[PDB]
């Protein structure tokens, strides 16, 4: 899971 964006 990216810390900066929820975009795939």
């Amino acid at each position, epitope marked *: *899971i990216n*810390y*900066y*964006t*929820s*975009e*795939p």
Partner: single-chain antibody
Amino acid sequence: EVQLQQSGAELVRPGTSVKMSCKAAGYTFTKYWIGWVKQRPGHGLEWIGDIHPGSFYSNYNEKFKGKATLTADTSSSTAYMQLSSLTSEDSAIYYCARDYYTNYGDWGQGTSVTVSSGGGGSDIVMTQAAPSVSVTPGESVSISCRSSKSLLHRNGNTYLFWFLQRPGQSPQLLIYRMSNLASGVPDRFSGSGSGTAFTLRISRVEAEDVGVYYCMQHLEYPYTFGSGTKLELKV
């Protein structure tokens, strides 16, 4: 079970601010993005922004920059949204939802806020041509959605989602990544897509299927919804 407990209804004066809360239980709060959605009467669903409660990074729909402020408190496992300079356009039900690998599967119960009496050109537009459809119980239906840009990602997945909002309920996820059924969803439901054109089908409509069906893209910010198709029973 995952619980998102939102704060109570607010009745407020124009020009003031209100701050609402979303307390998370049953999963690790710092691990997942939390998004916020606006349900205004006559205006379907609209995505405001999201926040990562570990890192505290937040991303906003340009439309709500300077209106909405998202914060999180890891000690109380609580996400907050503040709305400033309130106007009648801000009267709505506001939801928090947990983002599970792009699925908004868990929703708060909503917080009602009632206010007393050229940007966004790059947004992906989601079109539901039919505002309503009437079906004889036991008969089939198809519901269309299209996007203004392909929702295919370089990873090969297509970031199209279908939600059902039953009367008096929060939205619930039905179909994720174009074709996959959410847990517990009957095999009467299916999702297909062919380019930027998507179709939800229900093979035999039943009473519990009544409500408003929304498509949504989770490809790129700001996330966007179609305007909804209300499924009603034909008598």
